[PDB]
Design a protein around this ligand. Structure first.
Ligand SMILES: COc1ccc(C(=O)NCC(N)=O)cc1
Length: 284
């Protein structure tokens, strides 16, 4: 029974290696990675791979791995798929920990924009969780942490992390991670998956997929939101993506809204993540 080697980049930046039968469905690998991570609240997470166009794709757990990675390497990342709007509701501290690791990468990468003060506050909770109480012996006036906190580090930011870290004496790791999450969950781009698109007129927009619905950034700023309950049908055709809106009160007809995606694969990918968010957040 022939087995394929799988390499998974974990959220701590380390590499998990395992073997699965070459006809294995994604769920098989996901279950192995989640057992490795001692993760029981698996519903929020998934594996990504890179397609032939180097685009991130979710590995569908119901479909054969070989029919998704196709001609590419069996290389994956473990990632948060559904960002919970209220992480305090999660049953396990270890789930909140993995969510913290994902968000730290969201921040350093620039996917999750953050004010100076929030970068320093989030940083100070990470430092408290991982090193415990502030110690002056490790940190002089010229201290720079090994921890990556921001897309661009400044001495000012390092100083503010330390100033807030001092305020957190006695804080336990789960407590610091919960504080991290109470701040992160409020950021305007928390759990927003962004997709480049054009509107029905050809103007460049971003579509954001998240718990609260489909967001349109017709400018650099948000300009429209469609709450999932208002969406009856998500569809794609060629390079186009469509949402069927419920009729407003006393309106005779549903309304259909159309967007142009970079290519057919990008339209299909956007359709699938919207359907998945719609289902997940309808049930949560
Ligand atoms: C709409 O709800 C969904 C939709 C999709 C998933 C999913 O693919 N998770 C990752 C995995 N490998 O199991 C989980 C729940």
């Amino acid at each position: 029974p022939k087995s394929m080697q799988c390499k998974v980049i974990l959220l701590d930046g380390s590499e998990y290696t395992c073997d699965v039968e070459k006809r294995s469905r994604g769920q098989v690998l996901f279950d192995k990675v989640c057992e490795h991570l001692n993760l029981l609240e698996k519903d929020y997470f998934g594996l990504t791979y890179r397609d032939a166009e180097n685009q991130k794709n979710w590995l569908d757990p119901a479909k054969e791995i070989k029919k998704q990675v196709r001609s590419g390497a069996w290389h994956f990342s473990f990632n948060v798929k559904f960002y919970p709007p209220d992480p305090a509701q999660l049953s396990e501290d270890i789930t909140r920990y993995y969510l913290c690791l994902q968000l730290r990468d969201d921040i350093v990468s620039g996917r999750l924009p953050c004010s100076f003060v929030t970068l320093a506050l989030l940083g100070s909770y990470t430092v408290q969780s991982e090193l415990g109480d502030y110690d002056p012996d490790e940190c002089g006036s010229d201290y720079i942490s090994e921890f990556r906190f921001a897309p661009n580090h400044t001495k000012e930011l390092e100083d503010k992390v330390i100033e807030l870290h001092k305020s957190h004496r006695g804080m336990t790791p789960a407590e610091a991670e919960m504080h991290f999450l109470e701040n992160a969950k409020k950021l305007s781009m928390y759990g927003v998956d962004l997709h480049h698109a054009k509107d029905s007129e050809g103007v460049e927009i971003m579509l954001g997929v998240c718990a609260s619905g489909l967001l349109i950034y017709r400018d650099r700023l948000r300009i429209n939101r469609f709450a999932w309950p208002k969406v009856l049908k998500i569809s794609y055709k060629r390079n186009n993506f469509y949402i069927k809106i419920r009729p407003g009160e006393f309106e005779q007809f549903e309304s259909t809204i159309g967007f142009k995606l970079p290519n057919h694969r990008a339209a299909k990918r956007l359709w699938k993540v919207c359907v998945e968010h719609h289902t997940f957040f309808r049930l949560l």
